[PDB]
Amino acid sequence: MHPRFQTAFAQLADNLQSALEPILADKYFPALLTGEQVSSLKSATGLDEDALAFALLPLAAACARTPLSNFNVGAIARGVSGTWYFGANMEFIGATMQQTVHAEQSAISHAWLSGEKALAAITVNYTPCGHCRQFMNELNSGLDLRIHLPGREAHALRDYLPDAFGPKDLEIKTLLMDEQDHGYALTGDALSQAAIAAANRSHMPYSKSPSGVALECKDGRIFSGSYAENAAFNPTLPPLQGALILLNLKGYDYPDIQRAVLAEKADAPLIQWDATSATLKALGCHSIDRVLLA
Amino acid sequence: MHPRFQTAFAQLADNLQSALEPILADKYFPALLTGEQVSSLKSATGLDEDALAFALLPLAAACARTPLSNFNVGAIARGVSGTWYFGANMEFIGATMQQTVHAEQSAISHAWLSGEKALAAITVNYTPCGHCRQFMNELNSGLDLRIHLPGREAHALRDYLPDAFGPKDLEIKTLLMDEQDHGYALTGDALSQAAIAAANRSHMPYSKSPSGVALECKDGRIFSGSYAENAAFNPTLPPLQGALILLNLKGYDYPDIQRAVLAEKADAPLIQWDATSATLKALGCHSIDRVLLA
Ligand SMILES: O=C1NCC=CN1[C@@H]1O[C@H](CO)[C@@H](O)[C@H]1O
Ligand SMILES: O=C1NCC=CN1[C@@H]1O[C@H](CO)[C@@H](O)[C@H]1O
Ligand SMILES: [Zn+2]
Ligand SMILES: [Zn+2]
């Protein structure tokens, strides 16, 4: 078991620990649960989904990286597919506040990047900040998304975001998690191609600047991230962040990072290049390349 | 009159135009109104504050810079001092979504930077995004801040941000707009000293990384910006943005920018350097220096 979970695990109910023991066994437990797994857990404990989800929060929170806040936040996105994805906040020393990732954004991207077509709900161990409520309203699930918090009745997003601002406000018809393929040809080595394919799924109706980032680990494993714009602009998820989310959730660490590539247009109104490099260097990765879309 | 206002102005009621004619006369009308001015306006039109504020929105919106969205948003912060500050969104081509500024952040910083001790209300021509609701909850006015939108009853922030996340959540006691002075000694030329003094007023209880940016225009005018952190991290206002807000609001343009300086600690957990330079270069400013706090 991945040391991160150690303590959390020790804190679970016996019947839960038992059901989990085998799953968390693998150090590379992918911070996610399939329907089947979920079902199994429900049988072993008497928990319902909602209560189960809350019960797991602490494992999700155990994946947090909070050098600054020391405030660990865990979230669980529930796929319409039945799969449940963990998510946790990340803070990067040597960068800026704008590079931070919220437990909520983590889980949702985890899901999205993983191929999830839509979410049904999200559970968080702490009420969501406004930035995250806004982020959520970009999804194809809209204001209907249900949100579960400890010691609270559940609610739809619309409740947490009254008189909401969103894509419609900008006359945008395609939502995040909707299907997209920008059609760029894949080229170069593996890393580049991963980066480009990531750009191909990017959500960028506002600026129209597709981008993607792919990271290669020491063991040759690869994590890639897609750009996701947001109607309110700022809460947009940069492509780098996507990759780092996967990387951390999947059990790796910064130092495991070998080289990275960023793909984007050269003539785009917005440019990820600087922020990607800077942050990566901050994390200690020095090999970064950029590939130009067309 | 500053060409930007041209059309807006043409759209105002006659008695309003009249009262304004003289104020807006100056090309460098500072996008702000003192109590006296306000009073005057009320007398000339029969408007009450709330209605007056709405009536002016279009001038505030006229200060917007929206190369991307083409979506002009105006806001008016009302000082407890009686002064009213304009605010408008800004989008920067060649940068990233995270560098964007919301009409709301503009007005509030305008006020804060100007020396305002606290706000009583804010009026916006469009419902606020979640990022801005969160930004607002960092202020010393808390959830009480009143928010006025067109065709809506007014409300407190708490209404737009139910079950809010904020500074208290992190056990923070000093709010934005509260009084602060970090006490760094001022040194170097004027520009540096402006930058450092800006850092001295910075709000950064979370990361403890004070920073400030000062810009020098062709005419030798100087605009400076203070760093303002936010409990939810991301909605934090970088120091550069502060300066650019002032610069644009006060009637200048990017090209008027001569040289810039950024002051910050070298050993700070967060670092503004990269983003500042990058964005400034994007705006076409090549002279940037950094000064190290101590
Ligand atoms: O992830 C969440 N969710 C609820 C509220 C805040 N945060 C995060 O919690 C820390 C405190 O802001 C930062 O890492 C930030 O991203
Ligand atoms: O300034 C505001 N206030 C209300 C909602 C959005 N925005 C802004 O409006 C444009 C559309 O998101 C961007 O410039 C963004 O900063
Ligand atoms: Zn959040
Ligand atoms: Zn906003």
Write the layout of secondary structure elements.
Two copies of one chain form a homodimer.
Chain A: H1 6-10, H2 14-20, E1 32-33, H3 35-44, H4 49-62, E2 74-79, E3 84-88, H5 103-114, E4 119-124, H6 130-136, E5 146-148, E6 155-156, H7 157-160, H8 190-201, E7 211-217, E8 222-226, H9 239-249, E9 257-264, H10 273-283, E10 288-292
PDB class: hydrolase
Keywords: hydrolase
Assembly: dimeric
Description:
Two copies of one chain form a homodimer. The first copy, chain A, has 294 residues and is of the alpha+beta class. Chain A folds into two domains: 29-179, Cytidine Deaminase, domain 2; 180-294, Cytidine Deaminase, domain 2 (3-Layer(aba) Sandwich), CATH 3.40.140. Helices cover 32% and strands 17% of the residues of chain A. The first copy, chain A, contains ten helices and ten strands. The first copy, chain A, has helices at residues 6-10, 14-20, 35-44, 49-62, 103-114, 130-136, 157-160, 190-201, 239-249, 273-283, and strands at residues 32-33, 74-79, 84-88, 119-124, 146-148, 155-156, 211-217, 222-226, 257-264, 288-292. Chain A has a six-stranded mixed sheet. In chain A, strands 8-7-9-10 form a four-stranded mixed sheet, with helices on both faces. In chain A, a hairpin with a 4-residue loop joins strand 7 (211-217) and strand 8 (222-226). The longest helix of chain A is centred in the N-terminal third of the chain and has 14 residues, at 49-62. Chains A and B meet through helix 6 and helix 10 of A and helix 6 and helix 10 of B. The complex binds 3,4-dihydro-1H-pyrimidin-2-one nucleoside (2 copies) and zinc ion (2 copies). One 3,4-dihydro-1H-pyrimidin-2-one nucleoside sits between chains A (66, 69, 71, 73, 89, 91, 100, 102-104, 126, 128-129, 132) and B (165, 231-233).
